[model samples]
Target: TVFRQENVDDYYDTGEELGSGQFAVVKKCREKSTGLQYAAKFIKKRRTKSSRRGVSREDIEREVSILKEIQHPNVITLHEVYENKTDVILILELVAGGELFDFLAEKESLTEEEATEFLKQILNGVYYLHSLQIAHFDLKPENIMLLDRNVPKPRIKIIDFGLAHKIDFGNEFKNIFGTPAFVAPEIVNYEPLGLEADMWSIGVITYILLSGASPFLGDTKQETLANVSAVNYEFEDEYFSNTSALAKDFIRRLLVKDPKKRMTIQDSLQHPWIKPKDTQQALSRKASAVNMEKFKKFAAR
Candidate 1:
């Protein structure tokens, strides 16, 4: 679909500020015609002369291009765009559910079933991007948001495509970029990167979900980078004692040093931990116990 360029004021009524960064600010907006809510991310056309560096025109173009090309349930939807002399406004879907980080913080720890559901949605989004030959260089919790916070199982939406890039078959990207903790080993070594780099980030995310701790973080930034470079991490007994072996197996397969050996999204989805389980026995057992407890209470009454 062609990205529409219009007078921002003429198209929508802007609302409260949603977020802000060095070069852009996101604001809530309502479409004048449809009365539907949306997010308007306004990015500065040019960086301040004193600033060292900021988002380039090429970066904005690439990001918009990718967003326009991709359409998936788990991915952020771009509704329209308005640009003028000073800024470009991106009208996007309004996702009310907050970041995954906030959700994790409130929950403290997610059950295996809960984590699996979230991870599955993430994997589905990533898989869709890979199928389109686009790599999301950054895939941390901050970039994944929930559609509705009140729901039992809120839908996931992958956002922020500023660092994303299209990849040709066998092509490797050398530029180093991504959060330190989630950076892949190959990225740290300046090796060629492909879809595998994103997979590595997924591994890090999975680890944090199962065990509320970073796998590569150390005392300092240098130490954290070193840990990631060495592929250093551990599933200590304290955290993994109750975590299913299948869950650990899933993490191990993705966190491998060699990207070639790392599990693809398809393989990870098929892992025992991810695949649908026969919960009948477990549910039956739980139901029976509940009934017995109720009977005891009834007798006392």
Candidate 2:
């Protein structure tokens, strides 16, 4: 936890930009001492620390601290932190594999067993976080990563905790703090919904992974927001002809409007769909032509 107050350039040779957010930027870099490639995430401490200026000093510190504290196989690692006059550089592990959706769609014979591995890894990561009474409110496909998919079994790494929160078990925490794509009904209601909402997101993810089509499709995010209410959703045979009954049941239990009724992370982990049967092989998971088209469309978005 030693926050080094030095120039990142002194230790690492910076290269092309990897990614950028409104208040942060990640760049490809090489360590001068070891010649190993790494990613340097830069977060600025806004001038004069004004609220509306940009990301303030406390934001950078909080973000960096959380990234440093976490140590999990399914989560990205923060190697070191360098603080300067107005910014901090977070030296992170370089992950080369692409996103989860495109990788799945590109496969010709993607199976439920194979896809379940990815799901299980994420569930374990969420379970690890929930063990600490933390909720990854933002659980989008964008946050799920593959570490070198060329290998036999690509490792999954969950990232982006700038918006994640810690829940006090003594009391319920309430906030509409999540993406519109995977938000829960209670969030739209602005009521006290917590960890169960994360399970709701997992439900949506399971549906999309199995069928390759969004459960709630809309032309625009505004329209999607309206669809977030207790709207009935059906698994059209066109997309789910080969899926298992247990898979559909898992989604149905998770997509419940009432948070109390929704399955917990542990409940989801043990679900028959997640556990999978031994003697009976998983359903034929050949990508449906109709499903892939819509899946590609959604992934493109």
Candidate 3:
């Protein structure tokens, strides 16, 4: 079976190409019936001859099925899965504001208070996924999408489940999957890793968001991998030096090279940076004031 041009209208009018990755191309589409917009992720059937590695269609099917079964505020929801002769179309929730990567790149860096609030939201979301026994193998800035334009606590939706896998916490899974920059040391060393891998990625994300650069980077990708493999990362820069000790401690605990010593989600939530879940007002007030002052300083200069 082959794909035809006419089948393109089956979903919606393809407006523009949003992104292209190793496996698929995401296009922006507008539904003709409801007049709503969506990002259509189209994956072509992987032929054994095309990919020597033999990626399975069942993997994609399983991912869609898992995503459909789980419902979390921070996880991206799939609206529909349309199959044609040659491609599978997944209509996903449209997060319009853009990727967190772009936001961080544009702003240069986020303040400590702002980064803390954002990291807390990320942990809450991750905790939700953990409760469902799902682990998002990839956790990077590019995968986070901003939701809502006018809300004080603007939400973030984690996208891209290509590397995600269902796991039973009692048993460890050893397959290494994640962005090189954010991959944990144990994972890079081909050692068994658990949910703590996600925490390590989250720590890297926290560092990058607040400092506009990675804390474990090296001269080359291999060197970077080696550094991560050796657990040779630190937070001794001026940008992160002024951050709260609790915040630094939180990152340090999660960034440990040994997965056994990494922080757990329960402990993370208890960290001072995210304390008092029942009353986030005090933290919000302090963060808001800091943000306002930072904004004033930026505007003045």
- Per-residue lDDT of model 2, residues 166-284, tens digit only: 67668766776667768888876788867788898988888888777777667887777778785557899888877766777888999998888889998888887678555453442
> TM-score for model 1?
0.87
Identify the leading candidate in terms of lDDT: 1
Which pairs of residues collide in candidate 1? none
Q: In candidate 1, how many Å is residue 198 off?
A: 0.9
> lDDT, candidate 3, residue 261?
83
- Candidate 2 collision pairs: none
**How would you encode candidate 3's per-residue C-alpha lDDT over 65-121 as one tens digit per residue?**
777876788878888777665677788887777775554444434555665666777
How much is the lDDT of residue 38 in candidate 1? 94
Give the Cα lDDT of each candidate.
Answer: 0.79, 0.77, 0.72
Query: How far out, in Å, is residue 126 in model 2?
Result: 1.2
Top model by TM-score, which number? 2
TM-score of 2: 0.89
Please rank every candidate by lDDT, starting with the best. Answer: 1, 2, 3
